[PDB]
Structure 1
């Protein structure tokens, strides 16, 4: 296959995305969920790991680590400690609002994904760390999990397979850093949401000290559909090492901002002009696109014309795929004000633990607050670049990376706009 996009409704994993069907158990069983789950449990851990490795599923959290290789880190006998799946459901990324839709509209799919994932890794229970601001989504998911316990689908003797598996839901308390997997583990453990250092990886020392796999809602919820439809079905979409379907959140300056499930390697222009109703004012009104939520660098209109929305074609576009959250910015946008609001987000959501992020993200926000007004001189641009290069890869987690990267994208694609901002400040103030 060469061209991608135009995914059919028979090939969607997230049917009832929009809330148009019943989210509860009789609605979920009538759409394909909880079908032959006992056989998927009884065929073993290694079969499910082989199905996920066959499917080419990468980590839907945003980094794209191979999900089969990630879950196979738990494929080892116990040492007295229990083993845990932990489903990351914080989703604090600006641009990204898809896991809210999975929890709110396909909740039993996430429960069956917890069961299949925890069976594959030999886990004892699931901890769905939902964001605390998603309160109605959390109670939605708890009504679904009560339906799953009362139907005998989870808990003692889950799906009649003799396998015991609980599903716990822990609400957050309003910290974006608690979406990072070790900081999420620390937030589950009743501590400050501050990221641990790696090693130890959570497969060795995770939640409570136990072996633990933290995985996103989307990479967990597609796993029963991979185990039913097959690995070759999920590997049939997208390019090689870019396999599957993906939920996209096209927001910003489009006519119809929406969440839509789509084939993996779809072009960005086709996706925006097909599902979002195009950019407000036409495609020539396009200035920039942040392709995968705020952690990825923006790309200008000359890159957005032919770019494919998977991992490797966005690495080649010197950005990242991320959460596949498309933030569209038209020609009327004060783009330095938007990136400075974004760096302001990154200093308000930064847990203060290690030196480069705690100091340099506030120092970058002060530089960006002067760059919006133009109250600077152009030699501070490259200086700002070096400040980002003193945060990138010098931090504990990648929030420092995810704050250095928008600054790098803004400088790299809009240095002339910064310079004319500052020189018109200099002419009308000096």
Structure 2
């Protein structure tokens, strides 16, 4: 019932030595000829039966999401979009899954090629990653020259070629409409999701946006057994998600741990700073930056799962650990995260461009402590107003963590406010 320690049979293995010829020796592209020969009903049906959750910072299940982009009849040719850009600060899945083992992500494009019915595949990498982009292109150069992608792919009629497209230092490549608009040529602003979803219009084509970690699970489900990825973890949340332990820790390391693992044991397996949850003031974030900060009272009992964490009023989506020490300031740290959202908000929705930017200016006062005690109670209502009324989910991501400053905290905020007001006046 409980989550297994690390798991000996893991999906991700490339970390020590792999280039191009080493991928065949490790265990990649083994059943590529058999997977391409199999129909779309067998490929998408296996993914639906396994029940693999969304690896990206959304929380939406993949099994239903891939089904919309099946396309029975369409005029415009279908495309495949793989968003490999780095998400929230803390999540370092992009730097590990692309630079070390690039062929694992390339196998997902071929496996998801015949399944979705894609004519051309796009791999979108962030502008900050240039050393990772050089390794990704060289692996694609070795793949195309060998004769496995393009024209005739593993003895099949479907011809799909992967092309790397570099961004330019933008966080607004997160949303499904945002990454589509960035590759389209226009400014990096997300289109309205309710009328035209991903399957309706993306670069003038019915497409599907997927994370690099989510794309890496597709050859693991196809080549190896479907029950192997389904059994490990919880009943609702399935699939081994790479959770990176970062922040105030003695040894920060990204580990490929199984789903529904306890947070007290997760810090112990990667070796934390002061303690797992005793010595240091526990204000560790269950997500990258989007999720609200978890208190010391509810941390050891709570499990790091895709569904179970949301029930404890801290929805982990980005799948990253950000631990905070007793010596480090809690208020000053999250105020920088809001300042991060100030720089990285696109500027469409007025509750975000004039909301989050206004939220940062109020939060800057809270660090110095020149605010009224009534201002804490007000700010909780503004954060509620931002969360519900936005185009993209960055408005959500800048609303959840500031609500975490109101819940479980507030004696920390009042003591900073009362002492600074008495000293100045």
With the shorter chain as reference, the TM-score category is over 0.9
Deviation of 1:95 after TM superposition, in Å, equals 0.6
Residues 74 and 121, structure 1, Cα contact 8 Å, conserved in 2? yes
SS at match of 2:121: strand
Residues 85 and 126, structure 1, Cα contact 8 Å, conserved in 2? yes
Q: TM-score, normalised by structure 1?
A: 0.94
Q: RMSD over aligned Cα, in angstroms?
A: 2.2
Deviation of 1:384 after TM superposition, in Å, equals 0.6
Question: 2:420 & 2:305 partners in 1: Cα distance?
Answer: 40
* Bigger mean CA deviation after superposition, 69-78 or 100-109: 69-78
Q: Deviations over 1:294-318 (max 9, x none)?
A: 0000101111111111022211220
Deviation of 1:15 after TM superposition, in Å, equals 6.5
Deviation of 1:131 after TM superposition, in Å, equals 0.5
Q: Which residue of the partner structure matches residue 105 of structure 2? A: 110
C-alpha spacing 1:135/1:12, structure 2 compared with 1 (3 Å): farther
Question: 1:190 & 1:386 partners in 2: Cα distance?
Answer: 37
* Bigger mean CA deviation after superposition, 136-145 or 15-24: 15-24
Deviation of 1:14 after TM superposition, in Å, equals 9.6
Question: 1:308 & 1:8 partners in 2: Cα distance?
Answer: 10
Q: Deviations over 1:101-125 (max 9, x none)?
A: 1011110010001111122111112
Question: 1:168 & 1:36 partners in 2: Cα distance?
Answer: 23
Residues 3 and 233, structure 2, Cα contact 8 Å, conserved in 1? no
Question: 1:369 & 1:219 partners in 2: Cα distance?
Answer: 37
Residues 11 and 217, structure 2, Cα contact 8 Å, conserved in 1? no
SS at match of 2:9: coil
Q: Deviations over 1:270-325 (max 9, x none)?
A: 01111234546974214211111100001011111111110222112201121211
C-alpha spacing 1:11/1:49, structure 2 compared with 1 (3 Å): farther
Q: Deviations over 1:63-104 (max 9, x none)?
A: 221212111111122322111110011113111111221011
Question: 2:333 & 2:172 partners in 1: Cα distance?
Answer: 21
Question: 1:108 & 1:16 partners in 2: Cα distance?
Answer: 13
Residues 155 and 166, structure 1, Cα contact 8 Å, conserved in 2? yes
Question: 1:370 & 1:413 partners in 2: Cα distance?
Answer: 21
Question: 1:54 & 1:17 partners in 2: Cα distance?
Answer: 21
Residues 89 and 216, structure 1, Cα contact 8 Å, conserved in 2? yes
Question: 2:8 & 2:212 partners in 1: Cα distance?
Answer: 13
Residues 265 and 309, structure 1, Cα contact 8 Å, conserved in 2? yes
SS at match of 2:395: helix
Residues 3 and 259, structure 2, Cα contact 8 Å, conserved in 1? no
C-alpha spacing 1:113/1:12, structure 2 compared with 1 (3 Å): farther
Deviation of 1:35 after TM superposition, in Å, equals 0.8
**What is the count of residue pairs matched by the alignment?**
425
Residues 244 and 263, structure 1, Cα contact 8 Å, conserved in 2? yes
Q: Deviations over 1:168-217 (max 9, x none)?
A: 11111011012222111110011111011113444433321211100000
Q: Deviations over 1:335-360 (max 9, x none)?
A: 00001000000010000011100111
Unmatched 5+ stretches in structure 2: none
Q: Which residue of the partner structure matches residue 205 of structure 1? A: 200
Deviation of 1:234 after TM superposition, in Å, equals 0.9
1:380 to 2:396 alignment: no
Deviation of 1:330 after TM superposition, in Å, equals 1.2
C-alpha spacing 1:331/1:301, structure 2 compared with 1 (3 Å): same
C-alpha spacing 1:281/1:317, structure 2 compared with 1 (3 Å): closer
Q: Deviations over 1:349-372 (max 9, x none)?
A: 000011100111011101110001
1:50 to 2:45 alignment: yes
Residues 80 and 118, structure 2, Cα contact 8 Å, conserved in 1? yes
Question: 1:46 & 1:7 partners in 2: Cα distance?
Answer: 33
Question: 2:25 & 2:192 partners in 1: Cα distance?
Answer: 44
Question: 1:392 & 1:11 partners in 2: Cα distance?
Answer: 36
Q: Deviations over 1:355-405 (max 9, x none)?
A: 100111011101110001111011111111111011011111110110011
SS at match of 1:169: strand
C-alpha spacing 1:278/1:425, structure 2 compared with 1 (3 Å): closer
C-alpha spacing 1:252/1:66, structure 2 compared with 1 (3 Å): same
SS at match of 1:126: strand
Question: 2:155 & 2:7 partners in 1: Cα distance?
Answer: 28
Q: Which residue of the partner structure matches residue 219 of structure 2? A: 224
Question: 1:387 & 1:34 partners in 2: Cα distance?
Answer: 51
Q: Which residue of the partner structure matches residue 26 of structure 1? A: 21
Residues 18 and 101, structure 1, Cα contact 8 Å, conserved in 2? no
Deviation of 1:12 after TM superposition, in Å, equals 6.3
C-alpha spacing 1:237/1:279, structure 2 compared with 1 (3 Å): farther
SS at match of 2:387: coil
Q: Which has the higher helix share?
A: 1
